Ligand binder design. Structure first.
Ligand SMILES: [Ca+2]
Ligand SMILES: [Ca+2]
Ligand SMILES: [Ca+2]
Ligand SMILES: [Ca+2]
Ligand SMILES: [Ca+2]
Ligand SMILES: [Ca+2]
Ligand SMILES: [Ca+2]
Ligand SMILES: [Zn+2]
Lengths: 243, 168, 1120
């Protein structure tokens, strides 16, 4: 853009501002345009970064490196050499080759009710959607570290069972069973109040219901109940009694 | 010369704003035709309708309703030119005033209307021009009071200019 | 069989409790024909938990609604499901906007974990969000199945047939088998129900008050060999089909020397003097045309028509100069002229107020003859004051100095149906000599079409091929430079980077070019997009804007296009009465041991009956029905009695290029006023009305209105007050308000109207609505079609028929060949006989008996087959000629084909296309990090914030304009349920959420999963959120304030910082807002792929930097 010249600020140092989401652009030249015939410029200097350049960094894959000082991403021969025994908890390891030499592949697959958390050498935990990922001993290093985490079905709310209070002594983690108690006047009707949590992140079918009935209506003063069935305490929501 | 988008937004306001309140005349302000003070008209006269007597309140409500309703309905196939818009606005103002007896109600509250009228207000907007023009035709005592007031504020804000314009 | 017609007013039915309802798996399958303009959202059938007082959304619903609910534009089929175990509703919609008036087979399969919606037997939707059984048997009595529309009056308008339902999720093979049965009735263990509609009340019950629909007979479950050969994206008529254009390219018999009768119209004075064009010009131009088109088997019978009117010869026939224009205070170069008063003063600025004295003089003044002085108040236009031929610049006087070509055409009332009428005007524009009607235009066969030209160039040597270019316009030939210069923008789907039949000029032999006036190859920089240069541009082609001397040829594709357009559009123009041949080759349906069934296409013009003049049968259709377009239109003038009026736009066929937009080719309540005048608002609910009349009164069966635009604000009354049918009896049949869709035309069945009907009266209260055109279809065997004789056919084979058969005529377009021999090869063709006259024989088809053919369920790649669905219907994923349709990959024999995009599976070619299935693919991502910890401003057990942790359930769908936030929303998203709702304090509590992540890192963008956008139904304000990025040093990098919307959900917010500064590893994202109605179920860091200046700012030789892991760490190897 347009910048104001001054001998006091000479040599003028202008910072660079652009969208950091987009990669940079390797400046081959600097164009300075002006409407002043009296402007004389004796040199233009690129004041570069230390070691960062997202231009070629944007396109990098495992097996190739990025030179810090020169700031570009190029294929490399060495590096990635660390393959001990691949042990992943709560996971199945389908190893392409039993030996842990350079190029050995092993597909780690999370089991039922498990989330695949991928921990690599730095601060990027990317939980891949695919339960199975093949970690390769690329030149003798497992390119990714993997683990399987359990799952939970969250707490059951009133939508699960109406007119009930839910107690979860063991929580909601995979395998838990939460008990719903029918808050009065609701009553338990069924076989079991322990709703089970599966791997789906969602609770089991309601083996019992919490029925809410109004009790026998109090006798209206100076009035007699005309509905014979209403002497009972079993009156579902919306039951009518004529007085 | 009124902008087409202005026409669309004014008709949207009119079909949206109800008969009562400043809503009809609020959107009419800031138009390309520069006819201003309508929002000021509604705002000030709804301030001062309480100072007006009961017949004054009845007349002012009737006049506001007539202005909103008629100006909404007759805003039909008039040409885009602003002079026609100003002419029809003045015609509607005078029609509502005559059909709702502006003259006698003004006579009962000459001092109040003297209080509202300002030299800058008449210098700026043609609506208040129409109001004061009809006011000078609403009673000898009323026109005399209006002339005294307009002379007072005109000389206050003009000095010798008002006197030299008012030759005799 | 039988079918059920629903009027959409509530003719709903409940399934009787005598039949059980499936709990885990089911498959619904129904034939249907959906009328347009359904009340969105519209339901056709649904299961509801009638006892679930708070959550009625539990269950399943099928129907049609609009994608992008706001300003409804995409009416498509949909199915929604919510199992009782599931906490919310998932839903899916059709792949394309549904085509009304078509018999389609719709199915929906649920196996308990996979929800699938398939149209026409082809897969278009799959999902797996809802899992497990739909409901426990305990609530079985609560579930009720109710059809025809939801209890919310989300009814359906149209026809339903063969209501079938299995208790299992059938496979694609199974559903296609059921489709090819098309109404077979038999009991199966998995089939819950199979309704023949014979006794509906046996298994169904009506609504209250006897809201019962109508029962009719199914006309046809399916129709083979779909004749609806829709033209391509740039195609507008059947002439644009590749198959027919190839057939015309191969058949020189189809291109026998094309005698075309073209008429040139000339104007003289009253005494037959002062011709518009001299006879020498006419003869020279005719000779140039002949030299140009003999090599293309085209000859021109030159007819000359003369008109004599001195009162018109003196005046000026402006071209491209609208009468409504001029005096609009804006300079119009095409209207700038001295006889127009320099655009009526717009193109001539001067010190006007010095000529105010010239006003009121009663004598014309040039300075007063401008818009500012009202053109002297018409004094210059007054014939008595002065001459009007050079002074009347006011565009109101009937005695104006100038007119337009369209008004002259209205005066003339010529016979355009038999000749290409040629008119003359002033070509003010320099790029062309005039504007000509397209063959696909309304006026091509109407008396309004023609070619306007400048006599200054007509018959002039050196300028003679520009008229050839105008004729090329009139013959449907696109510009050879189209696709580069005529594009709307560089993203126009008609990019002609290479010469092709579907891009730009639609000719494979015309090289790409820009809008180049000279006849040389354009140099660098001539590209509008600038991407590519131009090679071997057809400047020698007559069509290019090259100079007329250099333009000297037409490419063979253009020749075939002209042949086809003459054969279809210009049937009445050519001499003789030879019947129209069949456009495309007949297709082999199927062969038995000794018999094979053959069908073919109707005539290209579509006239199945004799072409007799006067009688309406020249527009009769199959089944002895008639279909017509809007003949005449009128409406009342605002603020004026009566009104008369005659909007030609509202007449004829629909002509708008793109619906859901205000287009000038449509009638409008606004378009009936003076542009330089305030448009009066249409009156109170009597109905601002436009009336239409038809050329032939007739007993109708259905009506259709091509709406193009509608007000988006009020209710669902479609902005239409009422429809008033006009029968010959004089009765005004009211139809009430209807429902509109911005693209799909409104369709209405007219069963109750058994009387002769001539017109219609559409009543609307809209002040922005537009109507393009209208159309009417007659009942079966209407008396207007009985008296006339339908065309027949004769099938001829190589070798000829063994039995001496005269083809026994063909009125059903059907034949069966008894003479067959295994392995023998036969060539087939047909000739259309219109009584005694003989048409061009159809292209031959080579068939081998007992051999694989396109459509036998087995692919024959030697025939070029890409898919063999054993079906001859397009739109099922396999085209008519064994080529896989766009975006529909499939395998297997027969090819069970699916909409590959959006189903849920990603493949190699979906990486660059299906962001829905594969995500974004630029090198700045895109494996998104999801929240691991979530702290919120208002945390509660009812509405926890830790639901933001991780990716929320995709079954959650953003609800626009929420009345209130129920507890169901809180189970997946966090909103401030703890705080009360004081309207004097709800705008100050800045509710915020801090989504923390497992490991801090920068992100390319931010994903915000909005369950509720926070917008209130009664408020037009869209809530604003202050997004800030919290990094490792916990600095609150406030990205700023952004506007929420359910349409953009999941909202993608780009992230920008300063280059002079490094990144910052974002541990958490804080979203702050003043809206209590905002509920967010999760925030995702769209992580940068392989770059991070944070730790890169400290690197030295001997230590490396992990690209993807985006940090600089000491290393052991390398540097050797
Ligand atoms: Ca103009
Ligand atoms: Ca004059
Ligand atoms: Ca081409
Ligand atoms: Ca039209
Ligand atoms: Ca085949
Ligand atoms: Ca097919
Ligand atoms: Ca896909
Ligand atoms: Zn052209």
């Amino acid at each position: 853009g347009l910048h104001v010249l001054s001998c006091r600020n000479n040599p003028l140092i202008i910072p660079v501002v652009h969208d950091l989401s987009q990669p940079f652009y390797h400046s081959q030249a600097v164009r300075v345009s002006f409407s002043s015939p009296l402007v004389a410029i004796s040199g233009v200097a690129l004041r570069s970064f230390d070691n960062f350049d997202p231009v070629t960094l944007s396109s990098c894959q495992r097996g190739e490196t990025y030179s810090p000082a020169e700031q570009s991403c190029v294929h490399f021969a060495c590096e990635k050499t660390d393959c001990p025994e691949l042990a992943v908890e709560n996971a199945s390891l389908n190893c392409s080759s039993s030996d842990r030499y350079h190029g050995a592949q092993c597909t780690v697959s999370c089991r039922t009710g498990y989330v695949l958390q991928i921990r690599r050498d730095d601060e990027l935990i990317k939980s891949q959607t695919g339960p199975s990922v093949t970690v390769t001993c690329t030149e003798g290093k497992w390119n990714k570290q993997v683990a399987c985490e359990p799952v939970d079905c969250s707490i059951p709310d009133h939508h699960q069972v109406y007119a009930a209070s839910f107690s979860c002594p063991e929580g909601t983690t995979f395998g838990s069973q939460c008990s719903f108690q029918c808050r009065h006047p609701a009553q338990l009707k069924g076989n079991n109040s322990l709703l089970t949590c599966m791997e789906d992140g969602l609770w089991s079918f309601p083996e019992a219901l919490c029925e809410l009935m109004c009790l026998a209506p109090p006798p209206v003063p100076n009035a007699d109940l005309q509905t014979a069935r209403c002497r009972e305490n079993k009156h579902k929501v919306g039951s009518f009694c004529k007085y | 010369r009124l902008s087409l988008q202005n026409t669309a937004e004014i008709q949207h306001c009119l079909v949206n704003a109800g008969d009562v309140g400043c809503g009809v005349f609020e959107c009419f302000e800031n138009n390309s035709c520069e006819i201003r003070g309508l929002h000021g008209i509604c705002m000030t006269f709804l301030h001062n309708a309480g100072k007006f007597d009961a017949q004054g309140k009845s007349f002012i409500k009737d006049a506001l309703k007539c202005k909103a309703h008629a100006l909404r309905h007759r805003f039909g196939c008039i040409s885009r030119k602003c002079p026609a818009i100003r002419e029809m606005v003045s015609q509607l103002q005078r029609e509502c005033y005559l059909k709702h007896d502006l003259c006698a109600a003004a006579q009962e509250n000459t001092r109040v209307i003297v209080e509202m009228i300002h030299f800058k207000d008449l210098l700026l907007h043609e609506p208040y021009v129409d109001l004061v023009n009809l006011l000078l035709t609403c009673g000898e005592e009323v026109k005399e009071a209006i002339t005294h007031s307009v002379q007072v504020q005109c000389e206050q804000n003009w000095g010798s200019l008002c006197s030299i314009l008012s030759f005799c | 069989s039988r079918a059920l017609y629903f009027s959409g007013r509530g003719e709903q039915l409940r399934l009787r409790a005598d039949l059980e309802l499936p709990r885990d798996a089911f498959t619904l399958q129904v034939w249907l024909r959906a009328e347009g303009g359904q009340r969105s959202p519209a339901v056709i059938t649904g299961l509801y938990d009638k006892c679930s007082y708070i959550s009625r959304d539990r269950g399943w619903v099928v129907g049609i609604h609009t994608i992008s609910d706001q300003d409804n534009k995409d009416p498509r089929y949909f199915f929604s499901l919510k199992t009782d175990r599931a906490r919310q509703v998932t839903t899916i919609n059709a792949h394309r906007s549904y085509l009304p008036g078509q018999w389609v087979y719709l199915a929906a399969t649920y196996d308990g974990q996979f929800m699938k919606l398939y149209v026409n037997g082809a897969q278009v939707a799959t999902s797996g969000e809802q899992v497990g059984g739909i409901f426990s048997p305990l609530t079985q009595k609560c579930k009720v199945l109710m059809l025809g529309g939801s209890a919310l009056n989300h009814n359906y308008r149209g026809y339903i047939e063969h209501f079938s339902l299995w208790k299992v999720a059938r496979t694609q093979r199974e559903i296609l088998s059921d489709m090819e049965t098309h109404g077979a009735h038999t009991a199966l263990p998995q089939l819950l129900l199979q309704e023949n509609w014979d006794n509906v009340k046996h298994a169904w019950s009506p609504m209250k008050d006897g809201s019962s629909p109508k029962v009719e007979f199914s006309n046809a479950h399916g129709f083979l060999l779909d004749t609806s050969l829709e033209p391509p994206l740039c195609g507008q008529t059947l002439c644009d089909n590749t198959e027919v254009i190839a057939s015309y390219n191969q058949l020189s018999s189809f291109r026998q020397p094309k005698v075309v009768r073209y008429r040139v119209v000339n104007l003289y004075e009253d005494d037959h003097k002062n011709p518009t064009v001299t006879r020498e010009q006419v003869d020279f131009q005719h000779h140039q045309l002949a030299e140009a088109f003999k090599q293309y088997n085209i000859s021109w019978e030159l007819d000359v028509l003369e008109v004599s009117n001195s009162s018109l010869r003196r005046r000026l026939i402006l071209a491209n100069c609208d009468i409504s224009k001029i005096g609009d205070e804006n300079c119009d170069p095409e209207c700038n002229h001295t006889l127009t008063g320099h655009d009526g003063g717009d193109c001539r600025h001067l010190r006007h107020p010095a000529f105010v004295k010239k006003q009121h003089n009663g004598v014309c003044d040039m300075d007063c003859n401008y818009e500012r002085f009202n053109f002297d108040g018409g004094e210059c236009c007054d014939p008595e004051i002065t001459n009007v031929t050079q002074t009347c610049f006011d565009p109101d006087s009937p005695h104006r100095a100038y007119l337009d070509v369209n008004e002259l055409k209205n005066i003339l009332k010529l016979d355009g149906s038999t000749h290409l009428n040629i008119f003359f005007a002033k070509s003010s524009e320099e790029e062309l000599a005039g504007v000509a009607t397209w063959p696909w235009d309304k006026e091509a066969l109407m008396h309004l079409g023609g070619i306007v030209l400048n006599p200054s160039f007509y018959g002039m040597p050196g300028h003679t091929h520009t008229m050839i270019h105008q004729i090329g316009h009139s013959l449907g030939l696109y510009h050879v430079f189209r696709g580069i210069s005529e594009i709307q923008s560089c993203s126009d789907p008609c990019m002609e980077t290479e010469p092709s039949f579907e891009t730009g000029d639609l000719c494979n032999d015309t090289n790409p070019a820009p809008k180049h006036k000279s006849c040389g190859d354009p140099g660098p920089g001539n590209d509008t997009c600038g991407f590519h240069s131009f090679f071997n541009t057809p400047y020698n082609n007559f069509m290019s804007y090259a100079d007329d001397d250099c333009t000297d040829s037409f490419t063979p594709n253009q020749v075939a296009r002209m042949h086809c357009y003459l054969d279809l559009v210009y049937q009445g123009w050519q001499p003789s009465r030879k019947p129209a041949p069949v456009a495309l080759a007949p297709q082999v349906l199927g062969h038995t041991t000794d018999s094979v069934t053959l069908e073919w296409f109707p005539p290209i013009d579509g006239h199945f009956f004799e072409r007799e003049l006067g009688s309406a049968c020249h527009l009769c259709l199959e089944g002895r029905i008639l279909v017509q377009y809007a003949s005449n239109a009128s409406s009342p003038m605002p603020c004026s009695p009566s009104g008369h009026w005659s909007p030609r736009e509202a007449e004829g066929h629909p002509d708008v290029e793109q619906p859901c937009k205000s287009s000038v080719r449509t009638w409008s309540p606004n378009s009936a006023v003076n542009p330089h005048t305030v448009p009066p608002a249409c009156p109170e609910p009597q109905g601002c009305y436009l009336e239409l009349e038809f050329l032939y009164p007739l007993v109708p069966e259905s009506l259709t209105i091509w709406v193009t635009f509608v007000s988006t604000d009020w209710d669902s009354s479609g902005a239409v007050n009422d429809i008033k049918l006009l029968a010959v009896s004089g009765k005004n049949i009211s139809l009430g308000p209807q429902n509109v869709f911005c693209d799909v035309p409104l369709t209405i069945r007219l069963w109750d109207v058994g009387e002769e009907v001539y017109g219609i009266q559409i009543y609307t209260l809209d002040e922005h609505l537009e109507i393009d055109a209208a159309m009417l279809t007659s009942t079966a065997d209407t008396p207007l079609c009985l008296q006339c004789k339908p065309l027949k056919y004769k099938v001829v084979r190589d070798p000829p028929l063994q039995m001496d058969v005269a083809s026994i005529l063909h009125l059903n377009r059907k034949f069966v060949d008894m003479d067959l021999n295994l392995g023998s090869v036969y060539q087939y063709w047909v000739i259309t006989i219109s009584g005694t006259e003989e048409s061009e024989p159809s292209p031959a088809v080579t068939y081998i008996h007992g051999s694989g053919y396109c459509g036998d369920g087995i692919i024959q790649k030697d025939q070029g087959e890409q898919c063999d669905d054993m079906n001859k219907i397009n739109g099922d994923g396999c085209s008519l000629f064994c080529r896989q349709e766009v975006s529909f990959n499939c395998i297997d024999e027969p090819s069970r084909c699916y909409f590959h995009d959006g189903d849920g599976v990603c493949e190699e070619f979906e990486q660059k296309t299906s962001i829905k299935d594969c995500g974004v693919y630029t090198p700045q991502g895109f494996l998104d990090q999801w929240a691991s910890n979530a702290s919120v401003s208002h945390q509660d057990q009812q509405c926890p914030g830790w639901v933001i942790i991780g990716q929320p359930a995709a079954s959650q769908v953003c609800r626009t304009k929420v009345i209130d936030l129920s507890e169901g929303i809180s189970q997946h998203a966090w909103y401030p349920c703890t705080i009360s709702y004081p309207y004097s304090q709800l705008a100050q509590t800045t509710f915020w959420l801090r989504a923390y992540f497992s490991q801090p890192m920068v992100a390319a963008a931010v994903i915000v999963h909005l369950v509720t956008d926070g917008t209130y139904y009664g408020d037009q304000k869209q809530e604003t959120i202050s997004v800030q990025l919290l990094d490792t040093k916990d600095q609150s990098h406030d990205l700023g304030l952004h506007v929420l919307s359910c349409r953009n959900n999941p909202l993608i917010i780009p992230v920008v910082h300063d280059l002079s500064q490094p990144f910052y590893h974002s541990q958490a994202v804080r979203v702050s807002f003043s809206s209590p109605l905002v509920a967010i179920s999760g925030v995702a860091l769209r992580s940068f792929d392989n770059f991070d200046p944070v730790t890169l700012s400290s690197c030295q030789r001997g230590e490396t930097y992990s690209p993807a892991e985006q940090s600089c760490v000491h290393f052991a190897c390398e540097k050797t």
